[PDB]
């Protein structure tokens, strides 16, 4: 397949007036490891985040693309960006190749700047968006995650139960996908403190 | 997916499901496929969902145009002839499968469109892949000149027909109802499907997860 | 004569030129409020054969924004569709409705695209465009050059000094949308050369429900000095 | 200096426009048109100065569409051109939007054409004026002119050409009475205006009639012989 | 001034180019054309400035189709562009629709393209008026006449140059209703000898054309056998 | 026009586009080593007009830059979507922020094409820029309407810049400028030019540009935070008339 040539994981998980979004590190051609510190989660602003799974050439080209969208709107605008409207750019930013299209699909995760109401979304690789209340997942391991997803997670959930919740839904989900893993990485984002770790996982 | 549409006495019921899938799988549950047009102009969609939702978001943008220039009702003629005319133009590439219907001066009016550009304007229509289950509701059960709650049940009957028998179809039923004095967009309408309450609980709790870095980065 | 040429003081001629063309056209009053804005100017006619229900100087551009000019209907016309377009551009691309002040500034734009060529004269219209978003309401002058002001009221098109001295002396905030109409009204009759009738103006007003051109009944109503 | 190509002048005017308003009285004639409670009618003289012209061409009437009438005034090779710009338009509305066009919706179409002549120095625009009729849905009949520099508006009644002044004085002072307005009445105010303005004693030669109603929408253009039917009730009374 | 470009107007809302143009029309041989019960006939002044042109050079008789014909007064160069014209417009007419253009349609198609050229600063208008003729069962005779600014009429009669008054004045006279092609040839060519001056210029060609039914629908250069037979009576009747 | 030499070669139209300037709200800059500033006068100053913006004549370009304008506006809304252009251009292209003397060159590139090139306008606005970047640190610099870009340690635009200049050849203290001390400075070049006296904190304009932590900072003094930079001023050139 096409997006099975660079691999990838992607989740995003809300709590109370909370919300999480993981990934996993690794970067490879079809079977070989290259690097093990790829990124795959982009700020687009403080209490705001975006996770790319795909294709790597599109994930680098794709937030580029948007950063420069997003500086030249809070520019023109004197205000920072709500997750809403940022979906609907991505939203136009794929469509705009209905038929050259980026192989990406998108997560976003984030709080609105005024009254920090949790977001989360899933796109496909032209832009119809999913603004799910639970969880959301893209990448190699979408089966594999929407099942621990489904059984672990809980309506109202603090931050420390949260990261808990998402990192071992993205372990045991990584640990039976051959093109996804080594390493696996959390950012948890609240009104007033951004967390971030990495966490002990396999590297085979 | 599964949608479909009647003609009753005094206006226009239109219906659909939920789920929506990539391959397979069920990647949503609560989506909408019954999209803004005009006030009185509703759109129920049916194929690829990003082509539907920027054609029926293209069509809105072009009526909400028109009715301010001419400063009067949309017609759903009006909306039939944009979206045919541009669907013709792409050939089919634009996998957008529509069932139209609104409510102007002249009457209720349904039309059911076709990625090529082909319509067809008639009291009834289905579309999606439970067409077939809702159709044999229909062609069993409907009536002309019928009343509001009459065509609610029936609609209702046929989106759970698609549903029960269908794989690509589920987990709930919308309506939109439309007449000259009123519009109830109905979300949800019935719950057919509830997931099961689970017995045994998986809460982990705080130390079961192993780190190795860890930051923090205070905002205000 | 030519608008690709500064003269020696370092001034576009046309530009001011295109600025008498609205200082001789019909007033419109703009009042901002605490909880609304006002639009109000002067429809009248030179015959009792035009039937005034079929053209509008007070026209809306979405839910939420709304226009007036002084100068030249022609002109407005061209402006009103641009507007309109804008906004569902806009919308297109984010999916909100657009902030009163990027439609501003598109729009200016569009007065500047008119300005820099030879061979097109500029708009020979000013704009005033109400607003409601994030809570707050807004009021806009857009001109020919290309420059807009945000302002907390003003008055354009003939005697637009006379009724800008008026609002200086007779408007404050802790208004409402109420109070201010009444006010706008009064600086209208001050130019006003004969009896107002619910017919010889026309009005609109901007708040949290949006947009409204208000009818010829509700004028009639206020048109008693009453609220 | 401020007059050759349209640029503005100190006082903010545009005098090539005000000039094409006076070309509209170099053809040499005077149009009126009248609106009724059930109707809606235009009219117009036939001047034929030779005898070897066929007058079945010399008209200043025309069919828009079906339901759309119009009387043309001013430079007369103009006004063709306008008036195929208005079929064309007329036509792909249609095409697009799948209803016919309203007249409120045409004349402003109409004027935006023309009102690019004045804003762009390729072209000059039009010593044209232009009535149009037709009856609408709800609104009822209705009557529109539009200018060479992009005005229009409706009128209950209103004149194009040399006597416009007297004829819309005429037309004022009896619109104020509102008598129970009818076909009858309203062409023969029309041509009753004609006439003081003119004083000419029509013959059913010298003039063209075009009517729509809500009966019948269909514009038509009268005959001789049904003009005389008109004309001979006026010298009664 | 008021008077140097098309574009522009006067005061008064006149237009000098164009009628600076029709000045043109005014300055030139004079051409006629005459609507019968059955046809029509086309008869032109033709004035030869030297006798080395042959016999049949500057034809100002035209044909645009198989069934139309076309007499023109003014500047030589513009008329034969504005036939060129007329002919492409009634080929594409019989391309996208399948049968013969008719008259009213054709002489509004070359109108316009006449009346664009009176709007632009970059063109002067067209300096030559012109006469089409054509004849079918269905839409009968017809007689169309184009001025430069792009104004078209119907005729029974009428003619174009400089002796225009001359001409209509005789035309008046006939009942052209009445009669036929073969007599109204006489009536032409009687006209055509009346109004030419010899002393205000040399000797002259007569040039006549027809389409009707004697030709069924052809429009056809008049044979020599007629032609000289009119000419005669032409010389008979100015006897008077 | 703009495409014809004098005799004595010289570009007419170039110089009326720099007389159309004058005209203009003053604005000047003031480096320092602690940072860098601008200082613009707000001429839209009327009991009605409602200062709903962030500021009018303080433009933001980038998260290491701001400019300040002068002349025409319209113009000035042009070119500053233009530059603001080029700097995500540059970002896009190499992912590290633009010099401050890379975007000056691309947008005096531009004003030059208008000087040359037939049928246009050249623009009728002076601009300043204040940034900062890891080659050369905070800079300052000065664009002309023919497209002329010079580095400067202090400088004025607009109306009344050649007593601005003047004063700040005689009170300018090179390597011992902090940021107090040029805000210090431009209350007082503001005061001895406006012609409306007092300075009033609502007819003024203020930016700072400034390093925390290895990350730019450009803030807006409020109404307030300048009233103190006021009253300082009349204290000190009281205690300057003392001493009589």
């Not at chain 1, 994981?9 to 290259?34: E, L, P, S």
């Not at chain 5, 174009?160 to 040839?185: H, N, S, W, Y």
């Not at chain 5, 040039?207 to 032409?234: C, F």
Request: charged fraction near 25%; hydrophobic fraction near 40%.
């Amino acid at each position: 397949s096409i997006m099975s040539y660079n691999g990838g994981a992607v989740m995003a998980m809300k709590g109370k007036n909370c919300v999480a979004i993981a990934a996993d590190r690794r970067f490879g051609i079809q079977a070989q490891m290259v690097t093990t510190d790829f990124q795959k989660i982009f700020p687009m602003g403080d209490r705001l985040y975006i996770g790319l799974a795909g294709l790597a050439t599109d994930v680098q080209t794709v937030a580029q693309r948007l950063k420069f969208r997003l500086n030249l709107y809070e520019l023109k605008e004197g205000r920072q960006i709500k997750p809403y409207t940022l979906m609907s750019m991505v939203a136009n930013l794929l469509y705009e190749k209905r038929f050259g299209p980026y192989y990406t699909e998108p997560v976003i995760a984030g709080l609105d700047p005024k009254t920090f109401k949790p977001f989360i979304c899933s796109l496909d690789l032209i832009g119809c968006p999913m603004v799910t209340d639970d969880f959301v997942v893209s990448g190699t391991c979408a089966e594999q995650m929407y099942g621990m997803c489904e059984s672990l997670w809980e309506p109202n959930m603090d931050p420390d139960h949260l990261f808990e919740t998402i990192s071992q839904a993205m372990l045991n989900a990584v640990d039976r996908d051959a093109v996804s893993g080594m390493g696996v990485i959390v950012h948890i984002i609240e009104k007033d403190k951004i967390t971030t770790r990495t966490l002990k996982a396999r590297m085979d | 997916t599964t949608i479909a549409g009647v003609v009753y006495k005094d206006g226009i019921v239109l219906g659909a499901d939920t789920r929506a899938t990539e391959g397979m799988v069920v990647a949503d549950k609560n989506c909408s496929k019954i999209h803004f047009i005009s006030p009185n102009i509703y759109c129920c969609g049916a194929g690829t969902a990003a082509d539907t939702d920027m054609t029926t978001q293209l069509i809105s943008s072009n009526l909400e145009l028109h009715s301010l220039s001419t400063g009067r009702l949309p017609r759903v003629v009006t909306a039939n002839r944009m979206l045919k005319q541009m669907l013709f133009r792409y050939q089919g590439y634009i996998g957008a499968a529509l069932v139209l219907g609104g409510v102007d001066v002249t009457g209720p009016h349904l039309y059911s469109i076709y990625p090529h550009g082909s319509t067809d304007k008639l009291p009834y229509v289905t579309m999606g892949s439970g067409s077939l289950a809702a159709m044999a509701v229909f062609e069993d059960k409907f009536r002309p000149d019928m009343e509001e709650e009459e065509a609610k049940n029936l609609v209702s009957e046929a989106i759970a027909a698609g549903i029960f028998n269908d794989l690509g179809s589920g987990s709930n039923i919308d309506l939109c109802v439309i007449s000259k004095n009123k519009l109830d967009f109905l979300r949800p309408y019935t719950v057919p499907n509830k997931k099961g309450t689970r017995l045994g609980r998986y809460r982990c709790e705080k130390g079961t997860t192993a780190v190795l870095t860890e930051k923090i980065t205070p905002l205000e | 004569f030519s608008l690709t040429t500064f003269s020696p003081s370092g001034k576009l001629v046309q530009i001011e030129y295109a600025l008498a063309a609205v200082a001789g056209g019909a007033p419109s009053v703009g009042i901002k409020a605490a909880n609304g804005v006002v639009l109000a100017t002067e429809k009248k006619q030179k015959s009792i054969l035009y039937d005034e229900r079929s053209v509008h100087k007070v026209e809306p551009i979405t839910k939420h924004i709304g226009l007036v000019y002084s100068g030249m209907g022609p002109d407005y016309r061209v402006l009103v569709h641009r507007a309109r377009k804008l906004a569902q551009q806009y919308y297109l691309v984010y999916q909100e409705p657009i902030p009163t002040a990027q439609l501003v500034q598109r729009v200016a734009s569009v007065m500047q695209e008119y300005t820099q060529s030879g061979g097109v004269r500029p708009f020979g219209v000013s704009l005033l465009i109400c607003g409601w978003n994030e809570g707050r309401p807004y009021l806009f002058q857009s001109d020919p050059s290309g420059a807009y002001f945000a302002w907390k009221a003003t008055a354009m098109g003939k005697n637009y000094v006379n009724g800008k001295t008026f609002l200086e002396k007779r408007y404050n905030e802790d208004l409402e949308l109420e109070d201010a109409i009444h006010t706008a009204i009064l600086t209208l009759k001050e130019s006003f050369e004969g009896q107002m009738t619910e017919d010889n103006i026309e009005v609109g007003i901007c708040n949290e429900a949006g947009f409204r051109r208000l009818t010829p009944t509700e004028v009639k109503d206020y048109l008693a000095a009453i609220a | 200096f401020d007059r050759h190509i349209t640029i503005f002048s100190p006082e903010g005017r545009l005098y090539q426009v005000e000039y094409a308003f006076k070309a509209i009285n170099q053809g040499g004639l005077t149009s009126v048109a009248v609106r009724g409670k059930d109707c809606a009618v235009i009219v117009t003289q036939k001047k034929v100065p030779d005898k070897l012209l066929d007058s079945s061409t010399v008209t200043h009437l025309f069919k828009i569409t079906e339901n759309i009438g119009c009387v043309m005034t001013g430079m007369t090779a103009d006004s063709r051109s306008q008036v195929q710009r208005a079929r064309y338009e007329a036509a792909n509305w249609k095409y697009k939007y799948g209803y016919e066009i309203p007249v409120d919706m045409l004349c402003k179409r109409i004027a935006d054409i023309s009102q690019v002549y004045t804003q762009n120095a390729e072209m000059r625009p039009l010593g044209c004026c232009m009535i149009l009729i037709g009856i609408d849905e709800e609104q009822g009949p209705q009557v529109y002119k539009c200018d060479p520099a992009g005005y229009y508006c409706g009128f209950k009644a209103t004149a194009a050409g040399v006597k416009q002044t007297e004829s819309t004085s005429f037309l004022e002072k009896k619109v104020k009475k509102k008598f129970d307005w009818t076909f009858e009445q309203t062409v023969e105010t029309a041509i009753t205006c004609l006439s003081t303005v003119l004083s000419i004693d029509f013959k059913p030669s010298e003039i063209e009639v075009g009517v729509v109603t809500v009966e019948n929408p269909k514009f038509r253009i009268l005959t001789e012989a049904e003009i005389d039917a008109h004309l001979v009730a006026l010298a009664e009374r | 001034g008021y008077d140097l470009s098309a574009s522009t107007f006067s005061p008064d809302g006149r237009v000098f180019q164009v009628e600076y143009a029709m000045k043109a029309v005014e300055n030139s041989s004079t051409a006629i054309g005459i609507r019968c019960k059955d046809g029509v006939v086309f008869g032109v002044e033709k004035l030869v400035l030297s006798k080395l042109y042959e016999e049949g050079s500057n034809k100002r008789l035209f044909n645009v189709d198989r069934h139309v014909g076309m007499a023109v007064a003014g500047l030589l160069a513009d008329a034969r562009s504005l036939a060129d014209i007329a002919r492409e417009e009634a080929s594409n007419f019989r391309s996208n629709f399948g049968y013969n253009i008719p008259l009213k349609h054709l002489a509004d198609r070359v109108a316009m393209y006449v009346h664009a050229y009176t709007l632009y600063s970059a063109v002067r208008p067209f300096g030559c008026s012109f006469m089409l003729g054509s004849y079918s069962v269905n839409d009968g005779a017809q007689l169309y006449m184009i001025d430069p600014s792009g104004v078209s009429y119907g005729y029974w009669g009428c003619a174009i140059g400089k002796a225009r008054q001359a001409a209509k004045t005789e035309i008046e006279k006939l009942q052209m209703k009445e009669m036929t092609c073969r007599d109204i040839v006489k009536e032409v060519a009687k006209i055509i000898y009346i109004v030419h001056d010899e002393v205000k210029d040399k000797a002259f060609e007569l040039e006549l054309s027809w389409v009707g039914e004697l030709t069924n629908g052809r429009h056809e250069i008049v044979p020599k056998d007629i032609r000289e037979e009119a000419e005669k009576y032409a010389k008979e009747s100015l006897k008077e | 026009r703009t495409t014809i030499f004098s005799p004595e070669g010289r570009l007419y139209q170039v110089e009326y586009a720099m007389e159309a300037i004058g005209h203009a709200g003053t604005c000047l800059g003031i480096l320092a080593n602690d940072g860098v500033l601008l200082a613009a006068e707000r001429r839209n100053i009327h009991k009605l007009l409602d200062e709903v913006f962030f500021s009018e004549k303080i433009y933001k370009l980038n998260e290491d830059m701001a400019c300040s304008v002068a002349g025409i506006t319209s113009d000035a809304n042009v070119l500053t979507n233009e530059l603001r252009l080029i700097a995500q251009r540059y970002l896009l292209q190499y992912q590290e922020p633009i010099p401050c003397e890379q975007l000056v060159t691309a947008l005096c590139d531009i004003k030059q094409a208008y000087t040359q090139f037939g049928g246009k306008r050249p623009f009728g606005v002076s601009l300043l820029y204040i940034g900062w970047d890891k080659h050369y640190g905070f800079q300052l610099y000065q664009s002309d309407p023919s497209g002329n870009y010079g580095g400067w340690k202090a400088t004025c635009i607009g109306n009344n810049s050649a007593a601005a200049v003047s004063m700040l050849k005689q009170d300018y203290k090179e390597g011992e400028m902090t940021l107090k001390s040029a805000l210090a400075l431009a209350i007082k070049v503001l005061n001895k030019t406006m012609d409306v006296s007092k300075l009033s904190a609502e007819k003024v304009e203020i930016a700072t540009l400034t390093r925390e932590n290895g990350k730019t900072v450009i803030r807006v003094l409020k109404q307030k935070e300048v009233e103190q930079l006021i009253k300082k001023h009349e204290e000190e050139e009281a205690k300057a008339e003392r001493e009589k």
